[PDB]
């Protein structure tokens, strides 16, 4: 059981509609805690989780360090868009997107499990730092321009330094400073609703509301037989208050409801639940 500090960068051009835009968000597990948007008047790194409102007293240079980092990053991806556009011999007319995802996965006692730094151009893989954190994989011929640049500059070592160092150290600071929010293991609120459609066919919908973290498993069973192939599993959604929701639906023979059970697996649950429906 690990925790994660992950960052997400999106920089897209407005080919005739202002300079490019740069947006960066940071996550600890499934909770967002920081943001940066280059469109603001004088853009700054800003808190998005409660415990981040105390980082100014705990680290008096955190906001200016990261604001300077993000504003700098916005500049280099602005140029990066033009470089990559020339790599593919693309015109100035279209809009294009650079995406970046990096962070660390850390096991219980503060031990690093894996770092990563992956980038995409127009929604497809471009270059990624390998698992040994010492080499890059370019996805196409155009990305070999970037890989040759980054190899000769030794950028993999600087990435490994961060991923093995500050990434683990700040995931630990965040975990402890935000233990209330992050180490939370809230089970879902579960219940089964009902929507007949015929005098002859009926929908059973098994809900799970307000759970954190996002990982959850909903399974429908008929007399102990898994009905995964026959159910309608909706994509998990953010509840708007730092938690999540998800339901699984089945269509059953009317009158034969009590042979169907909903199996719910969540981390903040004592044991997996088996749910029947009852009038």
């Amino acid at each position: 059981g690990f925790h994660s500090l992950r960052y997400f960068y999106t920089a897209w051009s407005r080919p005739g509609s202002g300079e490019p835009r740069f947006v960066a968000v940071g996550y600890v597990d499934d909770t967002q805690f920081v943001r940066f948007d280059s469109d603001n008047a004088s853009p700054r790194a800003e808190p998005r989780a409660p415990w981040m409102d105390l980082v100014e007293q705990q680290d008096p240079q955190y906001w200016d360090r990261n604001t300077r980092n993000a504003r700098d990053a916005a500049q280099t991806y602005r140029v990066g868009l033009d470089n990559v556009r020339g790599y593919y011999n693309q015109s100035e007319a279209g809009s294009h997107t650079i995406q970046r995802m990096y962070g660390c996965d850390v096991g219980p006692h503060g031990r690093l499990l894996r770092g990563y730094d992956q980038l995409a151009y127009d929604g497809a893989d471009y270059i990624a730092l390998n698992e040994d954190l010492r080499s890059w994989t370019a996805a196409d011929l155009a990305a070999q321009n970037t890989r040759r640049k980054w190899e000769e500059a030794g950028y993999a070592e600087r990435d490994r330094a961060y991923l093995e160092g500050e990434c683990v150290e700040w995931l630990l600071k965040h975990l402890e400073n935000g233990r209330e929010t992050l180490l939370r293991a809230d089970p879902p609120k579960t219940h089964i609703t009902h929507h007949p459609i015929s005098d002859r066919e009926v929908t059973l919908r098994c809900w799970a509301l307000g759970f954190y973290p996002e990982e959850i498993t909903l399974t429908w069973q008929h007399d102990g037989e898994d009905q995964t192939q026959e159910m309608e599993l909706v994509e998990t959604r953010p509840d708007g208050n730092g938690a999540f929701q998800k339901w699984a639906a089945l269509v059953v023979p009317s009158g034969e409801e009590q042979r169907y059970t909903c199996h719910v697996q969540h981390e903040g649950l004592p044991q997996p639940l088996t749910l029947r429906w009852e009038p």
């Binding site: 940071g26 990261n66 470089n83 990434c167």
Partner: peptide, 8 residues
């Protein structure tokens, strides 16, 4: 903290 940003 943010990591370093490298130029494409």
């Amino acid at each position: 903290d943010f990591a370093n940003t490298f130029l494409l």
